[PDB]
Structures are given as C-alpha cells and as structure tokens.
C-alpha cells in the first residue's frame, strides 16, 4: 500500500518530469525561431555605445530634434530619440511606413522606458548609454510612447508620439 503508492508516485513523477522538460525544450525552440525572424529587431543591440548625458542636448545627434530622423539606407531611417524628464524628443517622431526604423535612444537624466503601444518595442533607456532597437511599422497612424520605468513624480504623465506616414 505505502510501498506500492511510493513506487507508483515515483514512476509517474518521472513521466511528468520528462514531459515538462520536453515542453520547456519546445519553448526554447519556439524562442530560437523568433531570434531568426524580423521580429527580433526589438532586441537591443547589445553593443556598448557610451555618451555624455550632460552635453547630449548641446552637441551631437540629440541636440537638434528636428534633424533626428536620418535616412541611413535605401529603405531605412535612424531616429535619434531623447527620453528625458518628462517627455521625448522629437515630438512627434515622424517615420514612413514599411521602412526599417533604427531607434537610437538615450537619456540626459535618469532611466526611462521606451514602450511603443501596439508594438513590441519595449526598451530601458539608460543615461550614458545608447539603446539601439529596430522596427518596421506595417500600419500607418499614431502610436503612443509610454515610459514604463519609474523616473520620479512626473512618471505617470510621461508620454510621447510616433507618427507613421503612408
């Protein structure tokens, strides 16, 4: 009874442990797939790109928000975004649909989030470093940027805008 119960429990546990391992292995394989597709562009470039948050608004590509959108390829734009307390520049960001957009986001003050509502773009923005991510907007219109990292009392009201043109 006890001796039997214990053999039966242990035998089925092994089955369960094998199934659970499998399911987990499948997820690993389903994640590796995402890594192979265009949707992986939202993964940060894990390359270090130091900048000086104290002069970032005076000299360099973040100093003139009206020139932050640069065509860097036949169908590619790079955007120099500044996430700061409590907003984003440029406002709005204006990109064409169907074009690959390389966002290069950094902060003058504290850490902010860069979360583009409706999309997978969701990246911490660290002062002193440049966050690099890529996205192609497939539908035109107005996307909201939300700051999802606590940045002080102005946090809940920190929003930005992306306008994707036809």
């Amino acid at each position: 009874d006890e001796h039997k119960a214990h053999k039966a429990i242990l035998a089925y546990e092994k089955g369960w442990l094998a199934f659970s391992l499998a399911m987990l292995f499948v997820f690993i394989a389903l994640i590796a797939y995402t890594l192979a597709t265009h949707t992986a562009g939202v993964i940060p470039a894990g390359k270090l790109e130091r900048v000086d948050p104290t002069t970032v608004r005076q000299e360099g590509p973040w100093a003139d928000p009206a020139q932050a959108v640069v065509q860097t390829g036949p169908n590619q734009y790079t955007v120099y975004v500044l996430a700061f307390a409590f907003g984003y520049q440029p406002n709005p960001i204006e990109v064409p649909q169907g074009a690959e957009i390389v966002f290069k986001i950094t902060s003058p003050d504290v850490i902010h989030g860069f979360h583009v509502e409706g999309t997978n773009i969701n990246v911490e923005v660290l002062p002193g470093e440049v966050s690099t991510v890529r996205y192609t907007f497939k539908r035109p219109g107005e996307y909201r940027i939300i700051c999802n990292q606590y940045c002080g009392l102005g946090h809940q009201n920190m929003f930005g805008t992306i306008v994707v043109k036809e």
Binding site: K4, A5, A8, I9, Y12, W16, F19, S20, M23, F27, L30, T34, T37, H38, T39, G118, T119, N120
Partner: protein
C-alpha cells in the same frame, strides 16, 4: 495503482502554462 489526483494537478498546471505561453506568443507576433 496510480496517483490520479497529482496527474490532474499537473494537467491544470500544463494547460495553464500552455494557454499563457501560446497566448503571449500570439500577442508577440500580432505586435511584430
């Protein structure tokens, strides 16, 4: 014989894992 209750529990756990995982994965691609 067999621990039918335990199996039922890990059944609910697997289904919950699967709904959550497949659910989010659909969401990821929709926003891709």
């Amino acid at each position: 014989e067999k621990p039918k209750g335990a199996l039922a529990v890990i059944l609910v756990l697997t289904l919950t894992i699967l709904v959550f995982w497949l659910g989010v994965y659909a969401v990821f691609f929709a926003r891709g």
